[PDB]
């Protein structure tokens, strides 16, 4: 298997809107570089022939709101490709998750350690990062906050396999 200590990919995900309101909101960002779009990203140009890879992800996350907008933010990893519609805040506080007020901390970097039951990420196995606003978002009269993430790099990269070039 090829090993890459640092592998920059600079892939930015789609920016996701959130209208202001009291309803609990979730923004899901899957981190699947094997996912193809209009252009092939730096990951696919060099390691798309692989069947699966392994390594820690670094993600730059950003929440753009007004200066008079309040919200609590829970950044939650989701491994092994599970689907969560609702979160139990009791469970999050029991796991010592700390929420951040987007009126004070609305920029950050998330290190995602490698966690997969199968042993590697793939086209079908990838981590998810869920931005969970439990109280919704309280903003000025029709605001939409935007949550945008960028997969910055992959640390301690390892990859195996050899797919067919379709």
């Amino acid at each position: 298997c090829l090993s890459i200590p640092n592998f920059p990919v600079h892939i930015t995900g789609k920016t996701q809107q959130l209208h202001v309101g009291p309803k609990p909101s979730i923004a899901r960002f899957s981190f699947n570089p094997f996912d193809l779009g209009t252009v092939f990203n730096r990951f696919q140009s060099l390691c798309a022939h692989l069947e699966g890879y392994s390594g820690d992800l670094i993600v730059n996350w950003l929440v753009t709101c007004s200066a008079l907008t309040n919200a609590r933010l829970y950044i939650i990893p989701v491994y092994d490709n599970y689907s969560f519609e609702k979160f139990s805040e009791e469970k999050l506080i029991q796991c010592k998750y700390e929420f951040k007020q987007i009126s004070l901390v609305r920029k950050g970097t998330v290190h995602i350690p490698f966690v997969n039951w199968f042993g590697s990420y793939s086209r079908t196995r990838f981590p998810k990062l869920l931005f969970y606003f439990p109280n919704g978002v309280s903003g000025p009269s029709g605001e939409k906050i935007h949550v945008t993430v960028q997969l910055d790099r992959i640390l301690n990269f390892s990859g195996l396999g050899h797919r067919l070039f379709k």
């Binding site: 930015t12 809107q17 950003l62 753009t64 029709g142 605001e143 939409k144 935007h146």
Partner: protein, 215 residues
């Protein structure tokens, strides 16, 4: 001495040994041999090595509200123009004909405390995105970073790549293309300004001159 003399294959043949040369008909002070080494020296009072660490270019373009869709290119900068402009920083740079240059670029948008949107600052190195591009497939993958335009001022460095060992600057319209791309609609859209102003400051992180222009 016989045929078992070992032969060392050298390219220096002894058909021309030490070429002595002696002055005959005049005085030495009237006939001198100079031994020099023609190396490249950057000038003393100017030359890109003074811009090392300092700004050399600055623009302030604008973009409208309606151009803030996902993917749209807001501002563009050809590096072959930024390095050949009319300012004093550029004219000191067009004198370098070939060499190396690592360039810092910084972006800064002036906003209220109401609106806030995210922007990507990309370095399209092969100039594959004209300014009339709303793709976002190309934007999402180009080397660069995202930043919030209300509380922040984002900068990064990039090295100009040459296929050879140095980079010919003279008549080189393939030095790269920096873009500012919009990722999302603004925060609030009602009763807001219809245009914005972004400042771009190109600096020199490092410059080496392997050949200098002389008239």
């Amino acid at each position: 001495p016989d045929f078992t003399k070992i032969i060392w294959p050298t390219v220096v043949e002894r058909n021309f040994s030490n070429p002595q040369s002696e002055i005959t008909t005049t005085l030495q002070e009237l006939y001198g041999d100079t031994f020099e080494t023609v190396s490249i020296c950057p000038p003393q009072s100017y030359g890109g090595e003074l811009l090392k660490g300092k700004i050399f270019f600055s623009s302030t373009p604008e973009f409208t509200r309606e151009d803030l869709v996902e993917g749209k290119i807001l501002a563009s900068f050809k590096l072959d123009e930024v390095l050949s402009g009319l300012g004093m920083g550029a004219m000191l740079m067009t004198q370098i004909m070939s060499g190396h240059a690592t360039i810092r670029v910084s972006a800064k948008v002036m906003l209220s405390k109401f609106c806030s949107f995210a922007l990507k600052l990309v370095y399209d190195e092969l100039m594959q995105l004209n300014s009339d591009t709303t793709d976002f497939g190309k934007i999402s993958v180009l080397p660069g970073a995202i930043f919030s335009t209300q509380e922040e001022e984002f900068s990064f460095d990039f090295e100009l790549f040459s296929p050879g060992v140095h980079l010919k600057f003279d008549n080189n319209k393939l030095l790269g293309k920096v873009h500012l791309a919009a990722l999302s609609a603004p925060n609030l859209t009602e009763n807001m300004p219809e245009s914005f102003s972004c400042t771009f400051n190109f600096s020199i992180v490092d410059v080496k001159t392997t050949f200098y222009n002389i008239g």
